[PDB]
Amino acid sequence: KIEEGKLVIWINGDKGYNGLAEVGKKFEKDTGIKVTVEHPDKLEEKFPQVAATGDGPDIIFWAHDRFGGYAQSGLLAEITPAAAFQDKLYPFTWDAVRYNGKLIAYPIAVEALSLIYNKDLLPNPPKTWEEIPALDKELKAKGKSALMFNLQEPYFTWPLIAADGGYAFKYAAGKYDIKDVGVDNAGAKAGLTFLVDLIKNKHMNADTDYSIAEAAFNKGETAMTINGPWAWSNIDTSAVNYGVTVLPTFKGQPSKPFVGVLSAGINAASPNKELAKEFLENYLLTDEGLEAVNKDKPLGAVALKSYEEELAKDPRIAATMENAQKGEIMPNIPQMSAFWYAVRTAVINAASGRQTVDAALAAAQTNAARRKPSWRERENNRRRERRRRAVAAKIYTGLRAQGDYNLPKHCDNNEVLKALCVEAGWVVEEDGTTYR
Amino acid sequence: VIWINGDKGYNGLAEVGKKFVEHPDKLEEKFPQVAATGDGPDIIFWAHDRFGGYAQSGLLQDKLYPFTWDAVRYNGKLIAYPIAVEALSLIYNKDLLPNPPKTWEEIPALDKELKAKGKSALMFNLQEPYFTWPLIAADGGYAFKYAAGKYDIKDVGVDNAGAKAGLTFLVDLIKNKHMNADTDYSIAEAAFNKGETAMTINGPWAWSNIDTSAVNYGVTVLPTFKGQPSKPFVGVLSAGINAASPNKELAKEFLENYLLTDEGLEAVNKDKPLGAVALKSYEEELAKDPRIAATMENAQKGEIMPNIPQMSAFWYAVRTAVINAASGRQTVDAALAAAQTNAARRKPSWRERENNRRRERRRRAVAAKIYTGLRAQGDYNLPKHCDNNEVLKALCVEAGWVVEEDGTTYR
DNA sequence: TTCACACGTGTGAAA
DNA sequence: TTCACACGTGTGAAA
Numbered sequence: 001k002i003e004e005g006k007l008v009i010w011i012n013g014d015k016g017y018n019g020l021a022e023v024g025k026k027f028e029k030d031t032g033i034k035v036t037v038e039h040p041d042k043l044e045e046k047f048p049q050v051a052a053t054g055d056g057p058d059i060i061f062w063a064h065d066r067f068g069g070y071a072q073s074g075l076l077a078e079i080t081p082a083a084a085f086q087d088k089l090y091p092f093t094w095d096a097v098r099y100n101g102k103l104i105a106y107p108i109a110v111e112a113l114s115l116i117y118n119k120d121l122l123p124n125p126p127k128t129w130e131e132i133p134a135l136d137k138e139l140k141a142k143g144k145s146a147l148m149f150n151l152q153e154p155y156f157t158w159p160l161i162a163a164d165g166g167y168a169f170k171y172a173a174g175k176y177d178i179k180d181v182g183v184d185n186a187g188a189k190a191g192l193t194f195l196v197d198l199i200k201n202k203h204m205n206a207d208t209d210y211s212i213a214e215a216a217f218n219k220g221e222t223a224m225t226i227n228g229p230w231a232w233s234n235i236d237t238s239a240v241n242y243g244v245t246v247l248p249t250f251k252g253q254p255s256k257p258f259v260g261v262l263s264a265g266i267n268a269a270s271p272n273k274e275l276a277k278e279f280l281e282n283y284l285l286t287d288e289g290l291e292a293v294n295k296d297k298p299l300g301a302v303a304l305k306s307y308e309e310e311l312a313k314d315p316r317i318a319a320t321m322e323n324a325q326k327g328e329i330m331p332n333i334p335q336m337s338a339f340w341y342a343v344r345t346a347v348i349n350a351a352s353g354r355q356t357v358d359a360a361l362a363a364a365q366t367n368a369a370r371r372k373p374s375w376r377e378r379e380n381n382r383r384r385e386r387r388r389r390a391v392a393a394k395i396y397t398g399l400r401a402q403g404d405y406n407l408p409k410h411c412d413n414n415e416v417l418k419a420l421c422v423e424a425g426w427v428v429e430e431d432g433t434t435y436r
Numbered sequence: 437v438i439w440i441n442g443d444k445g446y447n448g449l450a451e452v453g454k455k456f457v458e459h460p461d462k463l464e465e466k467f468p469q470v471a472a473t474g475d476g477p478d479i480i481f482w483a484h485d486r487f488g489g490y491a492q493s494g495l496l497q498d499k500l501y502p503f504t505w506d507a508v509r510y511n512g513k514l515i516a517y518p519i520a521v522e523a524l525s526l527i528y529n530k531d532l533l534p535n536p537p538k539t540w541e542e543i544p545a546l547d548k549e550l551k552a553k554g555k556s557a558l559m560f561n562l563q564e565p566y567f568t569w570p571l572i573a574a575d576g577g578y579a580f581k582y583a584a585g586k587y588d589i590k591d592v593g594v595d596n597a598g599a600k601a602g603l604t605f606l607v608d609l610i611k612n613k614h615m616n617a618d619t620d621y622s623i624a625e626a627a628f629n630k631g632e633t634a635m636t637i638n639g640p641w642a643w644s645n646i647d648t649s650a651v652n653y654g655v656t657v658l659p660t661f662k663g664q665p666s667k668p669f670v671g672v673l674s675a676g677i678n679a680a681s682p683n684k685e686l687a688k689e690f691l692e693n694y695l696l697t698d699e700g701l702e703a704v705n706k707d708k709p710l711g712a713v714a715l716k717s718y719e720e721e722l723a724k725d726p727r728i729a730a731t732m733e734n735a736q737k738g739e740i741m742p743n744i745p746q747m748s749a750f751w752y753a754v755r756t757a758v759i760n761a762a763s764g765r766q767t768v769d770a771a772l773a774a775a776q777t778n779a780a781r782r783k784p785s786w787r788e789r790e791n792n793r794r795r796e797r798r799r800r801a802v803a804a805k806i807y808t809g810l811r812a813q814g815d816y817n818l819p820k821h822c823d824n825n826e827v828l829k830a831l832c833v834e835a836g837w838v839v840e841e842d843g844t845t846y847r
Numbered sequence: 848t849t850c851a852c853a854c855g856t857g858t859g860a861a862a
Numbered sequence: 863t864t865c866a867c868a869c870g871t872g873t874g875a876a877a
């Protein structure tokens with residue numbers, strides 16, 4: 001619960017929350033307002049649950065794709081930056097946080113996956129996914145692997161699924177069509193099949209998660225990983241000399257990562273909107289604010305023009321934005337969470353052998369497009385069955401009371417119904433078969 | 437490939453492996469789930485208290501100390517090999533607090549003194565009842581009373597005057613804003629390691645991260661409550677072999693010949709301290725560390741955790757009681773009353789679930805066949821589409837009943 | 848779109 | 863122990 005006079009921030013555990021706390025300390029030193037930064041697990045899921053009742057942090061950080069669902073649920077304050085401040089950030093980052101014509105968060109940085117490779121183990125990274133199996137065969141002879149990345153979050157395999165034609169929601173006529181899902185087309189199946197076949201041919205393992213891949217690459221056991229700018233800090237501290245380059249092609253086509261804009265939304269229930277707004281506009285989104293976060297864990301391409309023009313000189317940022325250009329900014333519509341849940345199930349089930357590729361993507365197709373009933377539709381259904389049971393209960397109450405049907409002391413309603421049927425000239429077998 | 441909890445020295449055990457490991461979430465919960473399908477680990481490490489429920493469900497010599505073996509044995513058999521003895525201790529910042537408090541009762545006044553300097557007195561994980569149980573047991577609270585050579589499931593003490601007094605004091609610390617109900621492991625560790633809070637409660641595994649920080653810390657006895665010692669539940673980190681593992685003795689020799697060495701326990705121990713290890717050879721060296729001396733001084737005023745299968749229901753019950761009372765969702769009396777009831781709660785067997793599933797399937801099939809027959813041969817004056825309640829009404833009127841709109845029925 | 852029966856488990860009865 | 867109606871949501875029909 002937000003208490004007035006201080007700020008509590010939620011940011012994911014892979015970002016530079018220690019650097020962000022340093023910005024919080026400067027804010028506390030100038031205005032007196034205490035700023036606490038926390039990184040709980042599954043925070044993008046926890047926020048919509050607690051924020052609906054007015055709980056949750058003052059400020060929540062996540063990629064922009066989750067915020068439109070938050071805004072639709074009335075969990076976010078509208079962001080009211082003056083025009084002079086809006087111009088300090090790239091226009092496309094503001095677009096990422098615009099929903100129903102209103103700005104619902106401050107954009108922070110642009111995130112895109114890249115290929116990260118070990119220069120010493122592999123001076124020339126592969127340009128295509130197709131040459132990965134042969135490469136791993138060649139590295140397995142020296143006790144190494146070619147490629148390990150997180151297969152528990154669909155974010156990391158989506159560039160491959162999208163390469164030959166898979167997509168989330170088709171953009172048409174200025175809008176995303178929530179009924180036009182492309183996780184089931186030929187391109188998506190081609191990309192996921194190539195992933196599943198790397199697993200079947202023992203080039204990757206289906207249970208590899210984030211920490212396994214990160215540990216493997218930074219210990220020098222795999223030649224390549226796929227990860228974002230936040231991951232560069234831990235590689236720097238390791239004994240691995242790495243490079244950041246474009247993702248491999250698949251069927252001669254570029255991998256298309258879904259591009260995220262790390263964003264900071266303000267809780268609609270916060271009694272500290274202006275202090276939150278002041279912290280974000282005049283402390284975080286400054287050169288010095290972003291620098292403190294970025295030196296903890298790299299942010300990627302920051303939305304603030306002044307600081308990005310220094311970060312853009314870094315060849316790792318150049319590669320990041322090269323992959324970003326080949327990808328697409330994620331939608332922010334509320335249906336994105338249902339899309340992500342569906343594809344997560346599909347990748348894990350197909351990587352696991354629990355479902356075929358076609359069956360997994362077929363189910364993900366319908367789940368991502370499924371119409372979610374509103375609270376009122378749910379309540380209508382709940383009341384209809386409550387009423388149906390209520391009418392039945394009164395009928396059987398009356399039948400038991402006045403029937404004198406020659407029944408055992410404690411019998412179910414089916415027995416009462418049977419006694420009623422026989423009274424009306426019917427025969428009811430034990431299994432329920434009924435006729436006159 | 438082996439499962440160890442993410443707060444232990446998994447890198448230190450990985451270094452043992454290379455000369456010869458993953459840290460999942462909720463591993464203690466996942467293993468009973470994935471064993472029933474033959475999935476899971478070769479070897480699972482956890483405190484001994486969970487292994488009896490495992491042994492009851494069938495999922496699993498003198499170098500090591502005698503009592504460490506007793507903790508990992510259930511039904512006359514030995515289900516894991518003990519590695520280390522764990523007890524919580526009070527960890528304190530010497531620079532902020534040269535003289536740590538010896539009672540819980542003086543922590544409120546201390547926190548008011550520290551709040552004026554921008555600090556707090558105490559932060560520790562309030563989401564896991566392991567960390568609050570020492571205070572709950574101080575004035576008399578207990579899990580299952582040991583009597584007559586066994587733990588009695590009919591004598592549970594999470595609801596007595598001592599337990600209430602401990603939880604009431606904890607809740608009062610929160611209501612007087614000396615602690616926050618939502619403080620978890622990560623928040624408490626960060627605050628202490630950054631020098632923001634004067635004290636924390638944690639085990640030996642946490643010492644490594646404090647060493648990495650700039651905080652001069654000491655480890656000492658937990659504070660008393662009502663003049664009585666804090667009584668932590670003492671855990672023996674143990675090593676069970678999966679009953680379904682095809683590599684049992686290849687894993688067993690890894691246990692005895694590579695892990696439980698001094699070279700290898702050392703190697704894990706320098707990653708994150710294990711506590712008082714079960715191996716005597718190496719324990720004589722670590723025993724001279726004053727932090728280990730403090731750990732076992734807390735351990736002797738505590739009790740060894742039971743390993744009986746009810747421990748899971750006990751911990752779950754206690755965990756929701758603490759969270760519900762901390763947050764204000766339940767009063768202390770109501771929260772512990774619910775915990776007392778649920779601490780021994782029976783879980784229905786698979787077959788019992790299946791009995792219920794089949795019974796209701798049969799109930800619906802009998803009704804469905806009655807209404808199918810009525811619709812087919814009734815030739816009732818029903819609408820084109822209507823529910824079975826409408827058929828039932830039409831059957832009632834045929835038998836000489838009248839049924840009102842809402843279902844009130846009479847002759 | 849609304850709607851009905853299915854579905855497995857919850858609450859608590861009867862013993 | 864077994865048992866039965868309650869319970870809200872799933873599946874899929876009818877429109």
Ligand SMILES: OC[C@H]1O[C@H](O[C@H]2[C@H](O)[C@@H](O)[C@@H](O)O[C@@H]2CO)[C@H](O)[C@@H](O)[C@@H]1O
Pocket residue numbers: 012014044062063064065066111153154155156260340
């Ligand atoms: O995997 C689905 C997941 O993808 C994205 O999450 C990214 C996030 O954008 C990055 O900042 C980083 O934390 O990696 C995450 C994947 O683990 C979406 O932003 C998220 O909504 C979605 O669930």
Ligand SMILES: OC[C@H]1O[C@H](O[C@H]2[C@H](O)[C@@H](O)[C@@H](O)O[C@@H]2CO)[C@H](O)[C@@H](O)[C@@H]1O
Pocket residue numbers: 441443464482483484485486522564565566567671673751
């Ligand atoms: O909080 C309930 C929990 O307590 C113990 O868990 C300890 C564990 O023994 C330690 O090794 C360390 O991991 O901290 C844990 C608490 O977060 C019991 O072992 C466990 O069964 C119980 O659920």
